[PDB]
């Protein structure tokens, strides 16, 4: 019953800044009996299971870093991370219990900002192994970089192939507030065994001029 | 410390039935009832319901009426969750957590990665990524390990059975034609490598695999 919704739906603060995201119930949460608002907030970073940070809306759990802050009562709740450490690259939800059934909020997204920095392109060929069979895959890597918007374009012999490519963007890194992504150009052994210049041009923002990393079959 | 443990992920085909677990060890099982939280992919958390770890009764929420049942053999400290007639939308990751009086969840699980689809479970292929047969030499670097064509998820690449942790960008899968493909990349110092055996580790829970493939130089 208690509609729930948090806000904003993202946040891109910066190292050492204070954040204020919302979570506003629907139909009271101050339970008279108790004198406590049965609001609770949870932080689920990518992959771990969520972790609650505060209870009774305002109460900080045994373990939680003094720097997280749950205010709110009745129907207007707020969570605040001053000097937002990076690690904090998480997502925050909140829930109510004052009335079953339980409900979380869509969740408020907390991304991070920071110094910009081009990528680290590494290009890799179809491993001996794989080469044995119908398809080769070349792999390139754009390791650690701020911010998310980068690009890529392959080239099969001085020629951009936009067929058969597979890119996989990662989650904002773990300890620098960055990002990296993977493009896995793949091609039939033959389709591969034809041309010979394999290059990996990946455009970003860090430079008007792209980072070029190539690979000519005829040297391996 | 205190922990709850769930059966591993599980794959199933439109229409089956399934049973996940949640064995806890660190607290008097029956002295806190266990709840189940759901979570689709990239979506939010839905409150399944919970089992009175005593009364041994269940309360489902509306959206889990029927089909979804809860149970627990109060003994071997493990509270079940069972489903019936799965649907495509039934795909999602599951959870169980301890819920105290305060009104929150202090410890949950790792969750069950359960997914429901036809597609035939099919073992993955691991490949290595040593940089060129020849090239430059600075301080840092990268090695690969592209993990092609598999299904269903999930997969776990790690490096040297552990050892290498940062340096790794084990990326996220992709679905192009009823099969998953996925990479991961590391980075050591040219001094170390290749003078020191870098073996990436990939396992695919589903075909009970565990290929550990040594990034050998070119």
């Amino acid at each position: 019953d208690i509609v729930m919704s948090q806000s904003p739906s993202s946040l891109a603060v910066s190292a050492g800044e204070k954040v204020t995201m919302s979570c506003k119930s629907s139909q009271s949460l101050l339970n008279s009996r108790t004198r406590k608002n049965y609001l609770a907030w949870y932080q689920q970073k990518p992959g771990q299971s969520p972790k609650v940070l505060i209870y009774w809306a305002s109460t900080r759990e045994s373990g939680v870093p003094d720097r997280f802050t749950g205010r709110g009562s009745g129907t207007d709740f707020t969570l605040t991370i001053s000097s937002v450490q990076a690690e904090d690259q998480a997502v925050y939800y909140c829930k109510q219990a004052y009335i079953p059934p339980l409900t979380f909020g869509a969740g408020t997204k907390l991304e991070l900002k920071r110094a910009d920095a081009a990528p680290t392109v590494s290009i890799f060929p179809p491993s001996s192994e794989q080469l044995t069979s119908g398809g080769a895959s070349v792999v390139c890597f754009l390791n650690n970089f701020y911010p998310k918007d980068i690009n890529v374009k392959w080239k099969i012999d001085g020629s951009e192939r936009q067929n058969g490519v597979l890119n996989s963007w990662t989650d904002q890194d773990s300890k620098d507030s960055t990002y990296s992504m993977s493009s896995t150009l793949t091609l039939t052994k033959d389709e591969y065994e034809r041309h010979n210049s394999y290059t990996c041009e990946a455009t970003h923002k860090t430079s008007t001029s792209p980072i070029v990393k190539s690979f000519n079959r005829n040297e391996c | 410390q205190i922990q709850l443990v769930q059966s591993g992920p599980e794959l199933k085909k439109p229409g089956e039935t399934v049973k996940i677990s949640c064995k806890a060890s660190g607290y008097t099982f029956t002295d806190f009832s266990m709840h189940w939280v759901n979570q689709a992919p990239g979506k939010g958390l839905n409150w399944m319901g919970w089992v009175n770890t005593e009364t041994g009764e269940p309360t489902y929420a509306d959206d889990f009426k029927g089909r979804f049942a809860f149970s627990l053999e109060t003994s071997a400290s493990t509270a079940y969750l069972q489903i019936n007639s799965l649907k495509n939308e039934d795909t999602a990751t599951y959870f169980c957590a301890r819920f105290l009086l305060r009104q929150y969840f202090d410890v949950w699980g790792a969750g069950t990665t359960v997914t429901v689809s036809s597609a035939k479970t099919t073992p993955p292929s691991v490949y290595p990524l040593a940089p060129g047969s020849a090239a430059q030499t600075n301080s840092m670097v990268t090695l690969g390990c592209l993990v092609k064509g598999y299904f269903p998820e999930p997969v776990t690449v790690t490096w040297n059975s552990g050892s290498l942790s940062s340096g790794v960008h084990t990326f996220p899968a992709v679905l192009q034609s009823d099969l998953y493909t996925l990479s991961s990349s590391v980075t050591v110092p040219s001094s170390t490598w290749p003078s020191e055996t870098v073996t990436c580790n990939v396992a695919h829970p589903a075909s009970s695999t565990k290929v550990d493939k040594k990034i050998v130089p070119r």
């Binding site: 009996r33 108790t34 009335i99 | 205190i2 008097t28 009832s33 005593e54 309360t59």
Partner: peptide
């Protein structure tokens, strides 16, 4: 180690509300 506590009173009496003393 020495098994936890946190077992305290209460037990499990009506979720859709608390359960900690509503005094007379």
């Amino acid at each position: 180690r020495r098994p936890q506590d946190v077992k305290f009173p209460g037990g499990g009496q009506i979720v859709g509300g608390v359960y900690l003393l509503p005094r007379r």
